[PDB]
């Protein structure tokens, strides 16, 4: 600005840390949902860092809220913002995080592919679920919803001081009026599909239920093929094929859901009479009398008010049954999952 003090302006400019001075990231793009795997340029760490360049320019509402909340949130199972760079020339924003080598999308994909080349370790499954719940419990206790939980967002740290620790990432930090109706459906709770007007803690817990099933079987439990409207017929059909159609007593307030009459129009209870979570999970070699299953069923409760909370899930006797969950989900064993490849595509 012309009316800004010149001395003030040049002092700040002289002192301002620039992302390109501190970090080597060119050619090191790993993702774009622009995410880079970066090393420090001085060579004082040799640690890997994740640099996220925020999409757009300036500071949007979504960028503001993301910076706002990450700046406060501190917990071992939630991804931790190290530093923010404000690039004054191009008005671009960069976020620095510790680098998580793995995630559940890739880990599960690796096991699903290994099944073809003929299961996920059960101590690992439990430990992952425990840490996901711990991190989500922390967010929820602070009235922060994730609003977009899926395997790609459950990161897992590689070799280093936090080996095998879960890091929840990529929270949906801005949703206009906390609304799903404003601009994959596999991890979406049935109330969202029937037109729920707000995100809730319960919606996050359903997604954890979905992830947990997927870790146990290597298959997305509510897998389905790929608008403004919340009602998705094929996704609901898949839920009922797995779960059965809910009885009136299972979800009394279903009648209040905005899409209830559409549900009645398109679906018949009779269609799903041979369908249940018990039957589904048995086919995938998970016993219905297992503590794992009983907890899974409490997470995948259809009526959101009857869904277990994160804190209650952490207290489940499943976590007291042998084997105990471990802080490193790999339990000191060798990590077979491949590292992320650098992308060279234009």
């Amino acid at each position: 600005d012309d009316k800004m003090d010149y001395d003030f302006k040049v002092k700040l400019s002289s002192e301002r840390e620039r992302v390109e001075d501190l970090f080597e990231y060119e050619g090191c793009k790993v993702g774009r949902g622009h995410v880079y795997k970066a090393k420090r340029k001085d060579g004082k760490d040799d640690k890997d860092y994740a640099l996220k360049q925020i999409e757009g320019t300036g500071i949007s509402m979504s960028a503001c809220r993301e910076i706002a909340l990450l700046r406060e949130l501190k917990h071992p199972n939630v991804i931790s913002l190290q530093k923010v760079f404000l690039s004054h020339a191009d008005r671009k924003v960069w976020l620095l995080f510790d680098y998580a080598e793995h995630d559940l999308w890739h880990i599960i994909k690796f096991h699903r592919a290994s099944k073809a080349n003929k299961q996920l370790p059960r101590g690992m499954v439990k430990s992952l679920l425990y840490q996901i719940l711990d991190g989500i419990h922390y967010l929820h206790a602070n009235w922060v919803l994730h609003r977009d939980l899926k395997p790609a967002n459950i990161l897992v740290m590689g070799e280093g001081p936090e080996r095998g620790r879960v890091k929840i990432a990529d929270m949906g930090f801005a949703r206009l009026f906390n609304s799903p109706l404003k601009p994959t459906f596999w991890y979406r709770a049935p109330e969202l599909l029937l037109g729920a007007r707000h995100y809730t803690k319960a919606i996050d817990i359903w997604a954890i239920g979905c992830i947990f099933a997927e870790l146990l079987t290597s298959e997305p439990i509510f897998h389905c093929r790929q608008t403004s409207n919340p009602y998705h017929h094929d996704q609901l059909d898949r839920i009922f094929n797995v779960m059965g159609f809910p009885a009136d007593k299972d979800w009394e307030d279903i009648k209040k859901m905005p899409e209830h009459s559409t549900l009645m129009k398109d679906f018949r209870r009779n269609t799903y009479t041979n369908c249940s979570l018990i039957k589904y999970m048995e086919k995938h070699k998970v016993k219905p009398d297992s503590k794992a299953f009983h907890l899974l069923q409490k997470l995948l409760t259809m009526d959101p008010i009857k869904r277990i909370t994160s804190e209650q899930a952490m207290q489940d006797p499943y976590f007291l049954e042998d084997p105990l969950p471990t802080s490193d989900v790999f339990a000191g064993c060798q990590i077979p999952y491949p590292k992320r490849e650098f992308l060279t595509e234009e």
Partner: protein, 267 residues
């Protein structure tokens, strides 16, 4: 928005933005070469009122206006009034604070229109000329503000604990409107930079009880708090109202604004 509600003790507000009073006074000495101490606190009152008016024009809720006010105070707690024009900083603070919320957005045209309209209709005693800044200036200023604040955007305020305290008294109808109003008035001072918000709430509630002749002494005794620090806050509130009485901002602010140190231009 209850995001981070019970996290004050591990918050950036508490760990980074509760300042030492002597560090505040030391940094203020550079602007005290131009303005007296009286004139400096009068300027603070003026820009608190400017921010309030901008927020009311944009129909923002009190808590958003308070956050914006805290941003403004944090900036000038570190930096001279010459560094960035406070006329530019004030709407920039409101704009940034509104973006921390996800319930509605403040557009560019609406922000500038609001700055233009509020200064000409409510502050022409201080500003004969039209609001000269365009949206590119706001966006530039926003980057400087965010940098100075070390990206600390979540701000806690006395409104939430006040509401809890009065509901605990069973005296919401009698005491809340006055106590709330007094909380608004504390932003005319440095209190928000110096004390946890719940302590400021307790002080405002005390003053409200004294003004309305309500005996709440036993209720205050039932709390586990440092009442010395509460009394410190009470004294600043009582002083604020005497300052208010003796200050005519409408007659004085044009002259006071002319004494503000002016930005060094480029060479």
């Amino acid at each position: 928005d209850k995001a981070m509600a019970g996290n004050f003790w591990q918050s950036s507000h508490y760990l980074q933005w509760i300042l030492d009073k002597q560090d505040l006074l030391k940094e203020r000495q550079k602007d005290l070469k131009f303005l007296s101490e009286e004139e400096y606190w009068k300027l603070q009152i003026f820009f608190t009122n400017v921010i309030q008016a901008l927020g009311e024009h944009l129909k923002l809720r009190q808590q958003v206006i308070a956050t914006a006010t805290v941003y403004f105070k944090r900036f000038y707690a570190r930096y001279s009034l010459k560094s960035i024009d406070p006329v530019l900083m004030a709407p920039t603070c409101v704009f940034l604070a509104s973006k921390v919320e996800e319930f509605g957005v403040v557009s560019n045209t609406r922000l500038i229109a609001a700055a233009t309209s509020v200064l000409k209709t409510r502050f022409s005693y201080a500003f004969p000329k039209e609001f000269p800044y365009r949206m590119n200036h706001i966006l530039e200023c926003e980057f400087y503000l965010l940098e100075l604040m070390d990206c600390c955007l979540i701000v806690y305020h006395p409104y939430r604990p006040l509401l809890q305290y009065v509901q605990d008294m069973g005296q919401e109808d009698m005491l809340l409107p006055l106590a709330w109003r007094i909380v608004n008035d504390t932003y005319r001072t440095d209190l928000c930079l110096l004390y946890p918000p719940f302590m400021i709430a307790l002080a405002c509630l005390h003053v409200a009880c004294v003004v309305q002749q309500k005996d709440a002494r036993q209720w205050f005794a039932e709390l586990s708090v440092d009442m010395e620090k509460i009394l410190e806050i009470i004294r600043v509130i009582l002083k604020l109202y005497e300052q208010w009485k003796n200050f005519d901002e409408r007659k004085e602010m044009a002259t006071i604004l002319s004494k503000m140190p002016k930005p060094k231009p480029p060479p």
